[PDB]
Structure formats: C-alpha cells, structure tokens
Design a protein around this ligand. Structure first.
Ligand SMILES: CC(=O)N[C@@H]1[C@@H](O)[C@H](O)[C@@H](CO)O[C@H]1O
Ligand SMILES: CC(=O)N[C@@H]1[C@@H](O)[C@H](O)[C@@H](CO)O[C@H]1O
Ligand SMILES: CC(=O)N[C@@H]1[C@@H](O)[C@H](O)[C@@H](CO)O[C@H]1O
Ligand SMILES: CC(=O)N[C@@H]1[C@@H](O)[C@H](O)[C@@H](CO)O[C@H]1O
Ligand SMILES: CC(=O)N[C@@H]1[C@@H](O)[C@H](O)[C@@H](CO)O[C@H]1O
Ligand SMILES: CC(=O)N[C@@H]1[C@@H](O)[C@H](O)[C@@H](CO)O[C@H]1O
Ligand SMILES: CC(=O)N[C@@H]1[C@@H](O)[C@H](O)[C@@H](CO)O[C@H]1O
Ligand SMILES: CC(=O)N[C@@H]1[C@@H](O)[C@H](O)[C@@H](CO)O[C@H]1O
Ligand SMILES: CC(=O)N[C@@H]1[C@@H](O)[C@H](O)[C@@H](CO)O[C@H]1O
Ligand SMILES: CC(=O)N[C@@H]1[C@@H](O)[C@H](O)[C@@H](CO)O[C@H]1O
Ligand SMILES: *[C@@H]1O[C@H](CO)[C@@H](O)[C@H](O)[C@H]1NC(C)=O
Ligand SMILES: *[C@@H]1O[C@H](CO)[C@@H](O)[C@H](O)[C@H]1NC(C)=O
Ligand SMILES: *[C@@H]1O[C@H](CO)[C@@H](O)[C@H](O)[C@H]1NC(C)=O
Ligand SMILES: *[C@@H]1O[C@H](CO)[C@@H](O)[C@H](O)[C@H]1NC(C)=O
Ligand SMILES: *[C@@H]1O[C@H](CO)[C@@H](O)[C@H](O)[C@H]1NC(C)=O
Lengths: 426, 39, 269, 99, 204, 50, 49
C-alpha cells in the first residue's frame, strides 16, 4: 500500500494494491486421435531400389509425418541431415513433402552433399545444388544383395539420368559394397501433435488444436452440433470447447482473479491492516466471506455500528477494541417508532438556534500549459515535428484558457452579487 | 516545474474576496434581504 | 497476463494507474450519490401497527415482509427494469438497505409531515397533515375536512392507477432502463474492441508471439497496446462524462428528497 | 524516435486537458450552486427545506475560504416537545370552527 | 429459365457453437431472393462460388467437375456419389465430355421425393463443401422456407477453379456474393433465421 | 502512410466529439436551468431571491 | 470516400460507429432540450383580439 500511494504515511481508508490471479497448475494439450500416418515403410522397408543412374523421386504429402519412428531407427546403415535435424524434424512440417531412394555403393555419401559428385551422382543420384532435409541408408549388402551382387551402381540434376547403371556386390569393401539409399525433404506433411491426459475443475493452461488459453475446464450440459468445435459467449469470448479425443463439451470458466484491496486505519494510529480479495471465494486464497469477496485479518463483529471504512454490500470495517480491525454490517441509524395516532400531536415547547457550517468549492487552480515547451522544450527539431500534427497545441492552450477565464467568472458569480462595498457601522 | 506548466493568479485577490464577504455580511447584518432587492 | 506485452505497457508509464484512479473516483461517486439521495434521515423511522390515516391507504407503497421488505410498488419497479479484466463492484448500500431508507422516509412523511427534516419527528394525524398542506397551496383547510373521504378516494384510486401504469408497460421506467442499457453497451463495445486488429498482423496476442521473433512481435504488440489503451481512454472519458450526467440527476433527486418529500416545495412544476 | 515521444506526450496532455475540462464542469456545477446558495440564503430567507442546512432556515453568513466558500447557515431547530390530544376542528353552536 | 431463390442457401459460416444470439458476418452467401437459374449439361461459370440444389428422387444427378479448363490440361476436381458414398479425385481428367452412370494426380478421398442442396466455395487454397436434405411438396421451384446448410468436407487441395459442370432430374444454380448477414442462433446452437442486410432498407 | 493519416484524423475527430460531449453538458445544464426558469418564473411567481 | 483507406479504418473496429452514436446522442438531446424549455404547455393559447 505504501508503494501503491508512493508515500510512507497512509491515511485511513481502503486501497486497491494488486491483482489476485490464480496461476495455471499444469499444461494440457489435445488433438484428434493420431491417424493417416505417412507410409514411410514404402521406402524404409522396401526390398530393393532402382540404380543410382535412375534414382527414384516422389511426393510424401496428405499424410502425418511419423518421423519419430525413423529417428529411433539407429540400425540404419547411414543417416544425416542438412536443411534440418532429426531432433526437430519429428515436430516440423513440409510445405510440399517429398522423398527419394536409390541402389548405390557405400561411397555415395559424396552423392549426399549439395551439388553432389562421384559416379552415381554424375549419373543421376546427385543432391540439388542448394539441397535441404535429411538422408538415410539401409543395409542392402547384409541380405538384399546376393553373393553375385546386384545392379546397385552407376556412372556418368536430381533423379535425371549421359549416364548408365552397373553392378556392385556384398563381397566388396564398405565404400564399394551396395546399400539402399533414401531421402526426405520439405502444407503437405506435418509431424504428430502429441496429446496429454485431460484435467478438470483446476485452473490449467491448455491448447485444443490451435485454441490456446488458460482456464478452469469443467464438464458441461451444452449441445454442440457434431461439426462444431468451439463455443462462444455473447461478447464472442470462448465459453466452451469439444474435446478432440472424446465427445465431451467442457465449459472453459475463467481462472479466479480479483483486485486485492487493503483496509487500513491511518498509519499514524496503527500498522495492522486487513485484506479484501474482491469477489474471491475464501477456499481459493481470521477469514470472513462477504458479497464483496473474501476479507482476511478483520474480526467479524455481530453487532452493528456506523460505517467507518466502507467495504461494500452493507459491510464496513473499523479499528476498535488490545485493539484490532473489525468488520460489521453498517448501521443506517437508530430505529424510532414515531408514536402516531388519529388524535395525538407533538408540539415543541422550546427551540435551539443551530449554526450549521456548509462548505463549497468555487474555483480550480487557474492553470496554463505551454504545450510547445512541455512537448519539445528548447528543441527546434522537435518543435518542427510538432507542427506536422497541426492545430492540437493551439486547441489545448485555447481549452485551458477557457477553463482559466471560467474560474474568475465562477468567483465573481458567487461573491460579486453585491453592488456596493458596505462598511459596518462603527 | 519549469516544463511550460504555469499557475496563474486569480483576478480577485483574497483581500478583495474578504471585501466582498465583508460587504455581503455587513449588508446582511445592517439591512436584511433589502440589499439584494435594490437599495 | 502475457509477460511480453506487460513489459511493453510499462513504457507508457502512469496511463494505467490514472485510468484506474479515474474509474475508482466513479465507483466512489455512486456510493456517494446513493447516500445523498436516500440517507437524508438520521433515524430509521418505522411504521405503526394501526393504519387509521383518516381514509388514505398507503398499503401499496409501505413495506411488506412477504414481498425482501420492498413495498408492492417497489416490487413492480424492481421487476420492470432489467471476465476480460473488467469487474463490476457491489453498491455500498444493498437493495434491502435502500428499502429501509425509503421506508424510513415514507413512515416519517406519513406520521410526522415535514417536521422530521426540521428536527425530531413530531407525530401529527394524517387528516391534519393534509390541512397544513392545503393551507400550503392557499386552499382553506375546511375544503379538506368537508371533503375528507372524497379526497381519500381520489388518492387511493390514483395509487391504484400507478400499479396498472407500471404493471402494463416498462416505458415509464425508460430512463433507468436506458441508463442500464448505455452501461451494458459501453462495456460490450469495450470488450468487442479486443478483437480489432489496429493494423497489427492479428488481434490474438499469443498468435503474434507464435508467428514472429521478438523484435518483429514488439512492433505488432505495440499497435495492439496503443489501440486497446486508446479504447480504454475512450471508455473512461465516456464514463466520466456519463457519471457527471448521473451526478447532476442525483443532485436533482437529492433536492426532490429534501424539498419535495421532506417539505412542500412551492416551485411550480 | 521523437514521433513516439511527441505522440506520447501529446496523448498524455490531451488526457490532462480532458480531465481538467470535466473537473472544471464539476467545479462550475458547484460554483452555480454556491452562487444560488448565496442569492437565496444570504441575500434572502429560503423556504426550500434542507437547502440551507438542516432545520428551518433563518439566515446565513458567507466566509471566504481558499478556492471556495463557507456558509454559516443559521437555522431554527425545535428541540423539546409535549404530546397533546388534538382535533382538526371544533363544534360550537352546531357550526364547526377551524384554527 | 429462372426462379426466385427465396431465403434459401444460408450455411454455417464457421465450425462454432453460439446460442440464443444474433451473430453477424460478411462472407460469400447466396443473396436473399436472387435469381437461381433452372435446369432439367453446359459448362457453367464458378464466379464467387456456387449454390447448387436438385429436386431429385431417382438419384441420376450424380457428380460434379470443377477447374479452369475442367478437362485434360491440369489437375481438376472429380466428385461422384457412387452408392457407397462421395468419392473424390483431382487428376488431369481427359475423360468423356458428357458422362452418364448406368441407368497427373495429387489427391484422392472417400467419404420428386426430396430437395438436396449444396454449396461449393474456394478460399485461400481450401475447397469447402456444404449440404442439407429435405422432403418437399413443390416441383417447379425451391420451397419458400429456411434451413441452413452444414459443412461436409474441407479439402486443402490448392487447385484453381473458374468453371464447373454436373454429371448424369431437375436442378438449380446460383452464385455467392460478399453480403453481410445477421444470423439467428437458437437455444440449441442452430441457425434458424437470417437477414441479408443489403436486401432492403428494413434489412439494413 | 495512410495509417498515419487515419491515426491523426481519428484522434482529431475523437478530440472534437469529446469536446462536443462536454459542451453539450454545459448547454443541457443551461437548458435544465432555462426550463426551470420557465416553470418557476413564467408559469408561476418565484420567491427565489435573484 | 476512398476504398483503400476504408479497408484500413475497418481494422480499428468500433471507433467510427461509437463516434456516429455519440454525435447522434448530442443531436437528439437538442430536440429534447428545446421541448423541455418550450413544450411545457398542453394547448396553443391565443389572446383575445
Ligand atoms: C519406417 C518403417 O516402416 N519402419 C519399420 C519398423 O517400425 C519395424 O519395426 C520394422 C520391422 O521390425 O520394419 C520397418
Ligand atoms: C473421438 C474418438 O473416436 N476417440 C477415440 C476413443 O473413443 C478411443 O477410446 C481411443 C482408444 O485409444 O481412441 C480415440
Ligand atoms: C492528526 C493525527 O492523526 N494526529 C495523531 C496524534 O493526535 C496522535 O497522538 C498520534 C498517536 O500515534 O497519531 C497521530
Ligand atoms: C461471530 C458471531 O457472533 N456470530 C453469530 C452467529 O453464530 C449466530 O448464528 C447469529 C444469530 O443471530 O449471531 C451472530
Ligand atoms: C395487490 C393487492 O392490493 N391485493 C389486495 C389483497 O391483499 C387483499 O386481500 C384484498 C382485500 O382487501 O384487496 C386486494
Ligand atoms: C366517478 C365518481 O366521481 N363518482 C362520484 C360518486 O361516487 C359520488 O357518490 C357522487 C356524489 O355526488 O359524485 C360522483
Ligand atoms: C437474368 C435474370 O435472372 N433475370 C431475372 C428476371 O427474369 C426476373 O423477372 C426478375 C424478378 O425479380 O429477377 C431476375
Ligand atoms: C486420366 C489422367 O489422369 N490423365 C492424365 C493426362 O491428362 C495428363 O496429360 C498426364 C500428364 O503426365 O497424366 C495422366
Ligand atoms: C495455387 C495456384 O496454382 N494458383 C494459380 C496462380 O499462381 C496463377 O497465377 C493464377 C492464374 O489465373 O491461377 C491460380
Ligand atoms: C427450441 C428447441 O429447439 N428445443 C429443443 C428441444 O425441444 C429438444 O427436446 C432438445 C433435444 O436435444 O433440443 C432443443
Ligand atoms: C463459494 O461461495 C459460496 C457463497 O457465495 C459458498 O457457499 C461456497 O461454499 C463456496 N464454494 C467453495 C468450494 O468454497
Ligand atoms: C428553553 O431552552 C433553554 C436552553 O436552551 C432553557 O434555558 C430554557 O429554560 C428553556 N425554556 C423553557 C420554557 O423550558
Ligand atoms: C387498502 O387497500 C388495499 C388494496 O389497495 C386493500 O387490500 C386493503 O384492505 C385496504 N385497507 C384499508 C384500511 O383501506
Ligand atoms: C408520546 O406518548 C407515547 C405514549 O402514548 C410515548 O410512546 C412517546 O414516547 C411520547 N412522546 C414524548 C415526546 O413524550
Ligand atoms: C465406391 O468407391 C469405392 C472406392 O472409392 C469402391 O470400393 C466401392 O466399391 C464403390 N461403390 C460401389 C457401390 O461400387
């Protein structure tokens, strides 16, 4: 409160000082049941491949990119990446997803570099001059090649044959021996969107598909049509959602929040204070529940008194008897049964003159602002820029001068009703 | 405080206001309501 | 609660704090207005068990323990009028306290004339309070007594016509209904303005922060801050003007309480 | 850079002048009220109940105060009372007499 | 030949539930009381997107083709109802110019007594299909009433469309326009009435 | 470029409408006073001094 | 009356509508002020000749 008012002394009152705001207790992510996965085994579990002088190229679109399975395939004869990395590519997506494969000798790592080189690359199995994505190879010389070899060789653009095919065999050294080359590259195909379990009645961070937020997810009675995913309130704020993994409608009620207000007697009289959490329910935070919110550190008193510090909804607080802050329902005044009957009148036997003070403001402090000096003091550079905004400084200084002249008018309107300066008698 | 913000004095000084409250009060005491309705 | 936005809003300085101070002034003004209208009576006067007001019949306008305590006409009136960081706050006086003041004012007015404004409430029979209100309009009080039941029948009948006038159409309450609608319309306008783009790439704050790297997102968010902040300054300015318009009506209603309930104003119309 | 400072300082000063126009209209409402209190309760005797302090009004004396005014409203307040039996009128020779 | 479209051709503008609320949007809709062309076929324009409906009971109206050429030169939509369900292809179809059912490629998919109604629109690279079905009394024109069309499919296919045609007993065609509408969502989350704001001064 | 003119003109028009709202309160205060003078001072005789 | 400008002014949302609404509020209120002041009489009285 002292920091809120930028003051060490605080007068008696009630002051807003912060927001109470319940934080998300955990994070939820929900997507449809993962389905229509990319058939990557159509390349990565194929029985063979066409020779590097005729290397295959294909699309990989309209299907979910299950790259997490190939990322665990450490039994691959080779692997690499250049436009990405395998730790991110399982969560990435391709704008026009594509793949490639060929049969080649183990030396074909020289064919995987952008603007590739050597006989298979010069034949057709070369990488693009500005290549991207990831590359793999599989152990063909272990079982896909017989002891007489196979057509897994070539000699002199991507997948374009000035080129011819040739043999290679499993009896060769590791660079000469055949392997089943594979490639994948960059919407067309996106990696699987993993989902959490679902949590209810807690303040939680969430995402449903791309509908991010934070809220208290509660099961609800509402009847969405089968194609409807999200609900909205009258002011278009989201009020409910359909879960993508079971046909449940959840009200997204808000996480609890409200103004913290501090009740204080004046700091000149005590350093004890009591805190009102506006419209909070006390279980979420002496403690006392009110229609205005949860009030903490005030003693509830069952008697009623005139309102000292106003809290709201008929509650007020004061500092009273060892002393402490109390909260009570305010007194409107004492009760009085006026003793009416059809033949009785009360006539006053006596009077008092009273001299009731009444106090009224009549003028503000007359004020004027040089908007050229306030906005741009001493700077010619700034003063020129202020002229691009046109009439505003003229209009502001005019408006303040209107107020200023009105204060002298107000003061004359009140006091100058008298035509002559009457002296008293002596 | 120098930043083009200025406070301007009232047209009537507080002494002139005290002459009007003296005039109003000395009217009220010596002459009742009559000093509003003309002489 | 986006931290990336919240840091950028600190660069606009005291704008938030003076908007909150301006609205907090309007909140206090409403408790103050309601106090100045209703709390003009120092004691809660209460209605007698006998009701022999010379033939006049206040039973529609006096309290009812079966109704909250509100009168029959106060129940008609209470029927016919009808989370994005925004919060409503409660009135200081609940409707059950307002009903105690309108009861006290009314039970004073019935049992004791204007006297309960001038000092202690002094009882006077109701057929005599009307004589000393006919004399207040230059009708000699025998014109009441020679017509006392005829005058009572017209008053009781006219009170009956007010029940029908209020029961049949809400159009008489159009001022109160409009005041409620204007506030709801201002709040709806203020909430809907969160969806406006203000020349930024999206009005979804987390969407900007997902599309863009920090220095691009900063400029985009600074537009949303500027637009939303200008929408807040607009709303608060409009509510300050509207609050002065209601306070002018509250000063008038407080004056009608003081002169017109607690007295007999000779101010024509 | 200076366009940001100008737009900020200018939006801030328009906010201040807007506050002062609305505050000045509130002080004008109070000055017109004070002028009216002075005309009706210093220069006159008001019959407007509770317009010049609680009680029946007698007179008031203005006193100046910094940026405002104080009225000392002198009011008659009745202060001790007796219950009595009462009648709206009384018979005499069959004719009704009224006070 | 032409008939009055009445209040028909409204459809759910987004996959959102709203209840007891008068929501409003500007989107491609068939204008209220617009002229719908009547037919009993030539390649039609696609314009700002299409409303199509048929009073049918034989189920001989059976498919649609869309594209720029809608034939041979480029990947072109072929949509067929094959008595299992809807079947979809997008190949460069050099097929017969006026097919009837017995009385390269980049995507493929599988799903009078009545009026069956449809909307086809192309936005940003998605192609959208909507529909509704009703029994009927009236034969020559659309029945005067209200019943909103619901999304069927939502295809990311990216193909250009400027023409369409229908495959082989009475049907109606109209064109969508960038009208602003007021939509009456009821307690149960259904659109149940609408205003074409541009129609007349009371509608504004 | 046009967004600067929209920003400027919109802020200028908001200044004008804000000023006109405040001015209409000053005029309505005068119209309520004028109606009160007509009710009390034309339609009747007023004892309200000055 | 530029389309290319109005398409940007729509991105500011409700500001223009609440300006038209605010000024329409001023406008109707003048007809009310004038009827509050003058229309206090139920009949158009005329003098004798
Ligand atoms: C990308 C792909 O098809 N990988 C599969 C792998 O999951 C499976 O375990 C293996 C047989 O054990 O065949 C291959
Ligand atoms: C919407 C939907 O079909 N959800 C299914 C759920 O019913 C099933 O129990 C689960 C089994 O893993 O897979 C998912
Ligand atoms: C203006 C005011 O509050 N003054 C009080 C003073 O009278 C009191 O003796 C003291 C006790 O701490 O606190 C302070
Ligand atoms: C703190 C306290 O005294 N609370 C009591 C409450 O227990 C009791 O039910 C009520 C009866 O009027 O009076 C009060
Ligand atoms: C709404 C109302 O006034 N109802 C009253 C009813 O309570 C009463 O029983 C009856 C006989 O006096 O007159 C009528
Ligand atoms: C509707 C009306 O005013 N009726 C009254 C009637 O009750 C009364 O008995 C009569 C006396 O002359 O005057 C008339
Ligand atoms: C080209 C065309 O469709 N024109 C029709 C016109 O024949 C019809 O008479 C009119 C009635 O509103 O609506 C339209
Ligand atoms: C039925 C079909 O798809 N035909 C297409 C043909 O029109 C196209 O010219 C060719 C291009 O390779 O591919 C095939
Ligand atoms: C996604 C796509 O192919 N869009 C094409 C666009 O590139 C081309 O300029 C236009 C010509 O009409 O037709 C469409
Ligand atoms: C106005 C309306 O359409 N109400 C219906 C209700 O009659 C029906 O029983 C329920 C079935 O879910 O859906 C809703
Ligand atoms: C929430 O507040 C209500 C009173 O408004 C109270 O009855 C209820 O017990 C509270 N709920 C919880 C879970 O504390
Ligand atoms: C009236 O009150 C005064 C005190 O204010 C008292 O001295 C005086 O005696 C009282 N008069 C009567 C008649 O009781
Ligand atoms: C008062 O009037 C109400 C109906 O307006 C009626 O119920 C009640 O009996 C009446 N009582 C007297 C004393 O007239
Ligand atoms: C008037 O008499 C009644 C008893 O009949 C009593 O209750 C009331 O307090 C008395 N008032 C005064 C001022 O003595
Ligand atoms: C409809 O098409 C699918 C393949 O798209 C096919 O399997 C099925 O047999 C067809 N239906 C009929 C009735 O032939």
């Amino acid at each position: 409160t002292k920091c809120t008012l930028k003051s060490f002394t605080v007068e008696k009152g009630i002051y807003q000082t912060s927001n109470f705001r319940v934080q998300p207790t955990e994070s939820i992510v929900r997507f449809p049941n993962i389905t229509n996965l990319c058939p990557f085994g159509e390349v990565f579990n194929a029985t063979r491949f066409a020779s590097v002088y005729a290397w295959n190229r294909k699309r990989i679109s309209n299907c979910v990119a299950d790259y997490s399975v190939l990322y665990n395939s450490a039994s691959f004869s080779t692997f690499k990446c250049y436009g990405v990395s395998p730790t991110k590519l399982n969560d990435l997506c391709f704008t026009n997803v594509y793949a490639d494969s060929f049969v080649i000798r183990g030396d074909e790592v020289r064919q995987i570099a952008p603007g590739q080189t050597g006989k298979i690359a010069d034949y057709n199995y070369k990488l693009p001059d500005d290549f991207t994505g990831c590359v793999i190879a599989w152990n063909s010389n272990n079982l896909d090649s017989k002891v007489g070899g196979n057509y897994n060789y070539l000699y002199r653009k991507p997948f374009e044959r000035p080129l011819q095919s040739y043999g290679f065999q499993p009896t060769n050294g590791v660079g000469y021996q055949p392997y089943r080359v594979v490639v994948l590259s960059f919407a067309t195909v996106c990696g699987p969107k993993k989902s959490t379990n679902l949590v209810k009645n807690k303040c939680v961070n969430f995402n449903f598909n791309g509908l991010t937020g934070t809220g208290v997810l509660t099961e609800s009675n509402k009847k969405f049509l089968p194609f409807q995913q999200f609900g909205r309130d009258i002011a278009d704020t989201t009020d409910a959602v359909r879960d993508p993994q079971t046909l449940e409608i959840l009200d997204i009620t808000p996480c609890s929040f409200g103004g913290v207000s501090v009740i204080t007697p004046g700091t000149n009289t005590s350093n004890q204070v009591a805190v009102l959490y506006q419209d909070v329910n006390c279980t979420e935070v002496n403690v006392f529940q009110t229609r205005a919110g949860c009030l903490i550190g005030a003693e509830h008193v069952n008697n009623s008194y005139e309102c000292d510090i106003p809290i709201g909804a008929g509650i007020c607080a004061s500092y009273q008897t060892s002393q402490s802050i109390i909260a009570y329902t305010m007194s409107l005044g004492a009760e009085n049964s006026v003793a009416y009957s059809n033949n009785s009148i009360a006539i006053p036997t006596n009077f008092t003159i009273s001299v009731t003070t009444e106090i009224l403001p009549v003028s503000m402090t007359k004020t004027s602002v040089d908007c050229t000096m306030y906005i741009c003091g001493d700077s010619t550079e700034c003063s020129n820029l202020l002229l691009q905004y046109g009439s505003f400084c003229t209009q502001l200084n005019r408006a303040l001068t209107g107020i200023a002249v009105e204060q002298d008018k107000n003061t004359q309107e009140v006091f100058a009703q008298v035509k002559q300066i009457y002296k008293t008698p002596p | 405080k120098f930043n083009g913000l200025t406070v301007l004095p009232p047209l009537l000084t507080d002494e002139m206001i005290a002459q009007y409250t003296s005039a109003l009060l000395a009217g009220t005491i010596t002459s009742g309501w009559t000093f509003g309705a003309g002489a | 609660d986006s931290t990336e936005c919240s840091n950028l809003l600190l660069q606009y300085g005291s704008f938030c704090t003076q908007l909150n101070r301006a609205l907090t002034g309007i909140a206090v003004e409403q408790d103050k207005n309601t106090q100045e209208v209703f709390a003009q009576v120092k004691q809660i006067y209460k209605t007698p068990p006998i009701k022999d007001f010379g033939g006049f019949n206040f039973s529609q306008i006096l309290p009812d323990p079966s109704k909250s305590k509100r009168s029959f006409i106060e129940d008609l009136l209470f029927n016919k009028v009808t989370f994005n960081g925004l919060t409503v706050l409660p009135p200081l006086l609940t409707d059950e306290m307002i009903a105690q003041y309108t009861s006290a004012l009314l039970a004073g007015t019935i049992t004791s004339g204007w006297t309960f404004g001038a000092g202690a409430a002094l009882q006077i029979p109701f057929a005599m309070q009307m004589a000393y209100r006919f004399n207040g309009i230059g009708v000699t009080q025998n014109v009441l007594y020679e017509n006392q039941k005829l005058i009572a029948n017209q008053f009781n009948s006219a009170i009956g016509k007010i029940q029908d006038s209020l029961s049949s159409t809400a159009s008489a309450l159009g001022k109160l209904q409009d005041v409620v609608n204007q506030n709801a319309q201002a709040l709806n306008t203020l909430v809907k303005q969160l969806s406006s783009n203000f020349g930024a790439i999206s009005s979804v704050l987390n969407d900007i922060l997902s599309r863009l790297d920090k220095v691009e997102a900063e400029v985009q968010i600074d537009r949303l801050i500027t637009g939303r902040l200008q929408s807040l300054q607009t709303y608060v300015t409009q509510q300050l003007i509207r609050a002065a318009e209601i306070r002018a009506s509250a000063n008038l209603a407080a004056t009608k309480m003081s002169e017109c309930v607690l007295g007999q104003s000779k101010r024509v119309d | 850079q200076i366009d940001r400072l100008i737009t900020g300082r200018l939006q801030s000063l328009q906010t201040y002048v807007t506050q002062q126009l609305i505050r000045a209209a509130e002080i004008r409402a109070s000055a017109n009220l004070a002028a009216t209190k002075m005309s009706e309760c210093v220069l006159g005797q008001s019959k407007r109940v509770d317009f010049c302090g609680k009680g029946y009004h007698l007179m008031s004396f203005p006193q100046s105060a910094p940026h405002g005014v104080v009225f000392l409203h002198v009011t008659y307040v009745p202060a001790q009372e007796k219950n009595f039996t009462t009648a709206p009128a009384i018979c005499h020779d069959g004719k009704a007499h009224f006070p | 030949a032409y008939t009055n479209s009445f209040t028909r051709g409204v459809y759910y503008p987004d996959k959102v539930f709203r209840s007891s609320v008068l929501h409003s949007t500007q989107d491609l809709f068939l204008p209220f009381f617009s002229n719908v062309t009547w037919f009993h076929n030539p390649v039609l324009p696609f314009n700002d997107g299409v409303y199509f409906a048929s009073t049918e009971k034989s189920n001989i109206i059976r498919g649609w083709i869309f594209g720029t050429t809608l034939d041979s030169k480029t990947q072109s939509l072929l949509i067929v109802n094959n008595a299992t369900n809807v079947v979809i292809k997008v190949c460069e179809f050099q097929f017969c110019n006026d097919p009837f059912l017995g009385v390269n490629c980049t995507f493929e998919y599988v799903s009078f007594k009545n009026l069956r109604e449809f909307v086809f629109k192309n936005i940003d690279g998605y192609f959208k299909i909507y529909s509704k079905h009703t029994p009927i009394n009236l034969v020559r024109d659309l029945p005067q009433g209200f019943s909103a069309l619901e999304p069927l499919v939502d295809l990311p296919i990216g193909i250009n469309i400027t023409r369409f045609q229908t495959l082989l007993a009475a049907y109606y065609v109209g064109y969508l326009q960038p009208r602003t509408f007021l939509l009456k969502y009821n307690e149960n989350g259904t659109i149940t009435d609408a205003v074409d704001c541009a129609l007349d001064p009371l509608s504004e």
